């Protein structure tokens, strides 16, 4: 079975790296220097490095040449045991379902639990249930 290798990357750039790698593979697949990589895993919970699937280290070493993003993680290629080939795909509870409880960060109701009512298919705004906390304009000027 193929092996899964690890390569360092920048913090906050994981989907961009994935799409760039996909574009590079699609653009250099009918040439004399194809890429032998099988697949790359970029979990959402992790942020700071990405994974890559390949048999030998030379494959990914020669496959990440020229890219300016993976330059940092180029002089070291760590190998993980075979037991870690199934925990990476695990996800602990996406996270968008009506009639569920969610919390807020900005606004005035900071660090408070709320409840979802309706979701707009436009993916721009979403309703929310919460009890008001204002003073009803009696203390403020």
């Amino acid at each position: 079975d193929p092996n899964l290798w690890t390569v360092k990357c920048k913090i906050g750039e994981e989907r961009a790296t994935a799409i760039s790698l996909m574009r590079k593979f699609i653009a250099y697949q009918f040439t004399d220097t194809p890429l032998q990589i099988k697949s790359v895993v970029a979990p959402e919970h992790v942020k700071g490095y990405i994974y890559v699937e390949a048999y030998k280290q030379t494959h990914v070493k020669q496959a990440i040449e020229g890219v300016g993003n993976l330059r940092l993680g180029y002089w070291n290629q760590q190998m993980v045991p075979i037991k870690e080939m199934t925990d990476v795909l695990k996800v602990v509870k996406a996270n968008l379902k009506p009639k569920s409880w969610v919390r807020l960060k900005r606004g005035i109701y900071k660090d408070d639990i709320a409840q979802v009512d309706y979701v707009e298919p436009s993916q721009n705004t979403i309703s929310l249930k919460m009890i008001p906390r204002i003073d009803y304009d009696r203390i403020k000027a």
Partner: protein, 116 residues
């Protein structure tokens, strides 16, 4: 191919049968490639929001399903190369899942993730 690769990161959905992650423009224009005759997705937007759901996490660069352990674990070996996911939360209504079994299409839950 260049038609399955996502164009813009913003506004991206994912299917529930084969977990095909692409951009909304491609879904409206091209639609589900691995399952089109049995889904009838090309040429409309309502069905896209009906079946596909944006509630999904995880991205994988599938390129050789025939020779890959991840494809075997996810049961996507008989699909075309593309950008898939590992956990798509959702369930089709009780009006489209019925005809899939009648036409010889096994409906399985791709939400491999655990709950609590």
């Amino acid at each position: 191919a260049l038609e399955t690769v996502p164009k813009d990161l913003r506004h991206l959905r994912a299917c529930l049968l084969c977990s095909l992650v692409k951009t909304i423009d491609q879904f409206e224009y091209d639609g589900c490639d691995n399952c089109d005759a049995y889904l009838q997705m090309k040429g409309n937007r309502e069905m896209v929001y009906d079946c596909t759901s944006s509630s999904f996490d995880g991205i994988i660069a599938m390129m050789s399903p025939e020779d890959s352990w991840v494809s075997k674990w996810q049961r996507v070996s008989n699909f075309k190369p593309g950008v898939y996911a590992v956990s798509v939360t959702g369930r089709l209504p009780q009006g489209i899942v019925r005809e899939l079994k009648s036409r010889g299409v096994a409906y399985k839950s791709r939400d491999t993730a655990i709950k609590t």
